[PDB]
C-alpha cells in the first residue's frame, strides 16, 4: 500500500510503499478515508528524525484520521463502521498506569507514543490497524469531515480541564478570547460560540492584513478580530474588555504570560501551544500577584481521549455549515496530495483523501 | 473600649479607645477572646493609609479572630457561642453578586472590604459586631486556638480550587512541597500531612540556618527541609523528586515561575503569595511548554468563606498537639500586646488575648 511519510534527508513528505498491516488480537483493520493536516504535522516535517519509530527510516505522517472498518477481526466493531482513531499508543516498555486507567492523554513524555508524531507511524496510508478501544465510532454522515473530530477533541479536553478549575465556585462567564487564527484556534472559536457556557462576546487574536480568510471567518462568527500588532494581549482589557476565558493556540510564549493580565477576575486560560525555549524580561511580580488576588487559573492541556472524541461528534452537529465549508480550504486526493501541505495564509485546514466510502 | 490600630504617622500599632459598637439588624455583638497576627498584618503596618476606612484616621488591625457572642440581638446565634468571623464585608456601594451568591471570597478588587486589612476596621478591639451569616460557630474547645481557624480556612479554599483543577482525571498524588516557612506555610504543611489525598512525601522551602524553630517543625512533621540558598525550586526534581502538589506561600515571584519546573506531570501549584512588581529574565518558552506538554495547572487563591471555616474546624482536630504547641510561639495579653508584633526568626505565630471565656 501507499503511504505519505517523512524520511531522513527529504525536506518534504513523500509517497512510499509498505505492506498492508494485519490486525492483531483486539485490533480492527481500517481503510483510510481522509486524514487532516495541522500545525503539528508541519512541526514534525520541520523537526528531526528523533520521533521516527525504533529502527525505521521514515515516519508515516497523520494523526487526524477517519476510516471505514474493513475487517473487525475479533472486536465488537462491524464491517462498514466509520471510525476515528485516538492518537496515543503504549510505548516500547508496554502498558502503564495511564493506559490501564484509560487516561493515556495524561501520560508524561516517554510513557506514550503518538501515531504520526512520535515513536509510531501515523494514518496517512491506505490502511491502518488499531485496538478497538482506540477506535471511536462516529455518525456515518461525519465521514466526509471526520478528520475534524480529532482537532475538535483536543479542544473538548482542554475546555474540560479549564472548566474543572473553576468548578469550586459559581462561574458564569460571558467573554471568551481565542489566541491564534490557525485551524485549531478557528475551530475553537466556533466551538465557544455554541458552548453550553453561553458566551456573549467572542474575540480572536491574529496578525494578518486584510483581505484574509481567517479574519473573514472570525467576523462571520460575529467575533471581534484582534490584531496583535495593534493591540497586545495585555492591552485587550482597555481596548475591548477583560476576558473570562482565554484559549491560547499560538505557541507564542508571551501569550502564556500576558493572558493573566487579559483575564477577568476568576477567569481561566487554557494553554495549548508548544513553544521552544525563549527568555526575555517578564514582570513576574505582576503575573504572580494578579493570579492570586483575582483567583485566576492557567491550565495546560495536550492530546485527548475517547470521551472527548465522542463529545466532538455532538459539538460537530452544532457548528454552522458555512463555517465548516470555509474552514476546510482543500481536500486533496492522494494522486495530488502535496497541496495539502501548503503553508500560506489562504490555507486554513486541509486533508488528503485516500478513498471514498 | 480599647483597640489596637495603625495611625497615619505612627510606625507601630498603638492602643486607642472608641465606643463599643452596637449591633444592627442581623448582627450579633461579640466579645473578643484572641486575635492572631500574620504576615498580612505586618504588610498592613508597613503599608500606607489607603486602606483606612473612609474618613477615618486609623485602621483597627486584626482579621484572625475568635470571640464569644454576648448579645445575639435578632440572630439565631446564642449567648455564649464561640464564633470566628469571616473577613470580607460589602464595600461602600453595598451588596453585589459576590455577596448575594455567598462567594465574596471571589469578589475582585474594589468590590469588597476586608476587616483589618482594607476599608474596614478589624477585630483587635474588646468587642466587635458582625452579621450572623459571617459568624462561624466553632467547637467550644477551639476557643483557645480559635485564631487559627481563619488561616486554616485560607488553605482549605486554596486546596479546594487547586484540587478542583485536577478533577477531570484520576489524580492520586504522593508528593507535596510547601514553599515558605512562615505561619501559613507551616500550618499548610501540617494540613497536607493529614490531607485525605494521602501524601507520602512532604517538603518545605525556607532559607534559614540551624538552629531554627521552623526547621525543627518541618523535620518533626517528618518533612524534608529545602533551603533555597542550596537548592532552588527548579533544582528540586534532581535533588529530591518532582512534586505532585506545590503550595506557594513566600510571596517570592520566582517561585510562581519555577514551580512549573518542580511539578510532577499532571500536578498543580496553588499560589497564595502577594508580591510587588518585579521584572527579570524568564524562560517563558520553557514555562509555557512544560505547562502544556505535562498537563499542569497554576491556581491562585485569596480569602475564604464559611464552608472553608467549617472545614477548618475538622482539620484542626487532626493536627498534632505538639505542632499546635510549637507553632504558637506567643499569646500576649492586651496589657503587653506589643510583643505579638515581633518579627524575628523565633516568632512563628502569635496572638493577642483580649479576654478569657
Ligand atoms: N496541546 C495540544 O494537544 C495541541 C494539539 C494541536 C495543536 N497544538 C498547538 O496549538 C497551536 C496552534 O496549532 P494550529 O494547528 O492552529 O497551528 P498554526 O496553524 O501554526 O496556527 C498558529 C496561528 O497563530 C498565529 N500567531 C502566532 N503568533 C502570533 C502572534 N504573536 N500574534 C497573533 N497571532 C499569532 C499564527 O499567525 P501567522 O500565520 O500570521 O503567523 C497562526 O495562524 C500550535 O502551537 C500547535 O503546536 C497543540
Ligand atoms: N492569598 C491569601 O488569601 C493570603 C492569605 C494569607 C497570607 N498570604 C500571603 O502568604 C504569604 C505567606 O504569609 P505568612 O503569614 O506565612 O508570611 P511570612 O510570615 O512573611 O512568611 C513568608 C516566609 O517565606 C520565606 N521566604 C520568602 N522568600 C523566600 C525564598 N526566596 N526562599 C525560601 N524562603 C523564602 C520567609 O523566610 P525568611 O524570614 O527567612 O525571609 C518567610 O518565613 C505572604 O506573601 C502573604 O502575604 C496570602
Ligand atoms: K454565560
Ligand atoms: K474596556
Ligand atoms: K459543545
Ligand atoms: K495557514
Ligand atoms: K507571516
Ligand atoms: K496518595
Ligand atoms: K531525583
Ligand atoms: K482535612
Ligand atoms: K518570623
Ligand atoms: K532574614
Ligand atoms: Zn492535528
Ligand atoms: Zn492572617
Curated annotation (Swiss-Prot), chains A, B:
Annotated positions binding NADP(+): 181-184, 207-208, 228, 272-274, 301-303
Induction: Up-regulated by glucose.
Co-factor binding details: Binds 2 Zn(2+) ions per subunit. One of the zinc atoms is essential for catalytic activity while the other has a structural function, according to Ref.4. However, the crystal structures show a single zinc ion, the catalytic one.
Catalytic function, reaction form: D-glucose + NAD(+) = D-glucono-1,5-lactone + NADH + H(+); D-glucose + NADP(+) = D-glucono-1,5-lactone + NADPH + H(+)
GO molecular function: D-glucose binding; glucose 1-dehydrogenase (NAD+) activity; glucose 1-dehydrogenase (NADP+) activity; glucose 1-dehydrogenase [NAD(P)+] activity; identical protein binding; NAD+ binding; NADP+ binding; protein homodimerization activity
Binding site for Zn(2+): 38, 63-64, 150
Necessary cofactors: Zn(2+)
Classification via SUPFAM superfamilies: GroES-like (SSF50129), NAD(P)-binding Rossmann-fold domains (SSF51735)
EC annotation from Swiss-Prot or TrEMBL: 1.1.1.47
One of the GO BP terms on file: non-phosphorylated glucose catabolic process
Function (record text): Catalyzes the NAD(P)(+)-dependent oxidation of D-glucose to D-gluconate. Displays broad substrate specificity since it is able to catalyze the oxidation of a number of alternative aldose sugars, such as D-xylose, D-galactose, and D-fucose, to the corresponding glyconate. Can utilize both NAD(+) and NADP(+) as electron acceptor, with a preference for NADP(+). Physiologically, seems to be involved in the degradation of glucose through a modified Entner-Doudoroff pathway.
Annotated PANTHER family: GLUCOSE 1-DEHYDROGENASE, ZINC-TYPE ALCOHOL DEHYDROGENASE-LIKE PROTEIN C1198.01-RELATED
Other facts: The reaction follows an ordered Bi-Bi kinetic mechanism, involving an ordered binding of NADP(+) and D-glucose, followed by an ordered released of gluconolactone and NADPH.
Protein name (database record): Glucose 1-dehydrogenase
Native organism: Haloferax mediterranei (strain ATCC 33500 / DSM 1411 / JCM 8866 / NBRC 14739 / NCIMB 2177 / R-4) (Halobacterium mediterranei)
Lineage: Archaea, Methanobacteriati, Methanobacteriota, Stenosarchaea group, Halobacteria
Gene coding for it: gdh
Amino acid at each position: 500500500m501507499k503511504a505519505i511519510a517523512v524520511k531522513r534527508g527529504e525536506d518534504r513528505p513523500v509517497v512510499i510503499e509498505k505492506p498492508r498491516p494485519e490486525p492483531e488480537s483486539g485490533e480492527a483493520l481500517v481503510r483510510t478515508l481522509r486524514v487532516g493536516v495541522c500545525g503539528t504535522d508541519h512541526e514534525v516535517i520541520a523537526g528531526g528524525h528523533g520521533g521516527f519509530p525504533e529502527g525505521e527510516d521514515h515516519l508515516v505522517l497523520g494523526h487526524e484520521a477517519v476510516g471505514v472498518v474493513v475487517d473487525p477481526n475479533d472486536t465488537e466493531l462491524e464491517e462498514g463502521d466509520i471510525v476515528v482513531p485516538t492518537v496515543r499508543r503504549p510505548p516500547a516498555s508496554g502498558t502503564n498506569e495511564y493506559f490501564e486507567r484509560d487516561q493515556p492523554d495524561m501520560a508524561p513524555d516517554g510513557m506514550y507514543f503518538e501515531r504520526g508524531i512520535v515513536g509510531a507511524h501515523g494514518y496517512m496510508s491506505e490502511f491502518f490497524t488499531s485496538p478497538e478501544k482506540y477506535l471511536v465510532r462516529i455518525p456515518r454522515s461525519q465521514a466526509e469531515l471526520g478528520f475534524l473530530i480529532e482537532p475538535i477533541s483536543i479542544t473538548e479536553k482542554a475546555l474540560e480541564h479549564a472548566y474543572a478549575s473553576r468548578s469550586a465556585f459559581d462561574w458564569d462567564p460571558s467573554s471568551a478570547f481565542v489566541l491564534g487564527n490557525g485551524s485549531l484556534g478557528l475551530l475553537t472559536l466556533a466551538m465557544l460560540k455554541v458552548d453550553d457556557k453561553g458566551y456573549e462576546n467572542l474575540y480572536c487574536l491574529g496578525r494578518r492584513d486584510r483581505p484574509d480568510p481567517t479574519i473573514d471567518i472570525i467576523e462571520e462568527l460575529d467575533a471581534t478580530y484582534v490584531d496583535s500588532r495593534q493591540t497586545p494581549v495585555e492591552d485587550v482589557p482597555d481596548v475591548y474588555e477583560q476576558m473570562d476565558f482565554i484559549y491560547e493556540a499560538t505557541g507564542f510564549p508571551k501569550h502564556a504570560i500576558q493572558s493573566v493580565q487579559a483575564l477577568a477576575p476568576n477567569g481561566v486560560g487554557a494553554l495549548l501551544g508548544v513553544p521552544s525555549d525563549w527568555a526575555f524580561e517578564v514582570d513576574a511580580g505582576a503575573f504572580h500577584r494578579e493570579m492570586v488576588l483575582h483567583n485566576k487559573a492557567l491550565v495546560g492541556s495536550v492530546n485527548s481521549h475517547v470521551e472527548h472524541f465522542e463529545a466532538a461528534t455532538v459539538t460537530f452537529t452544532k457548528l454552522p455549515k458555512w463555517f465548516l465549508e470555509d474552514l476546510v480550504t482543500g481536500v486533496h486526493p492522494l494522486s495530488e496530495f502535496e497541496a495539502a501541505f501548503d503553508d500560506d495564509d489562504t490555507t486554513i485546514k486541509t486533508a488528503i483523501e485516500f478513498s471514498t466510502v
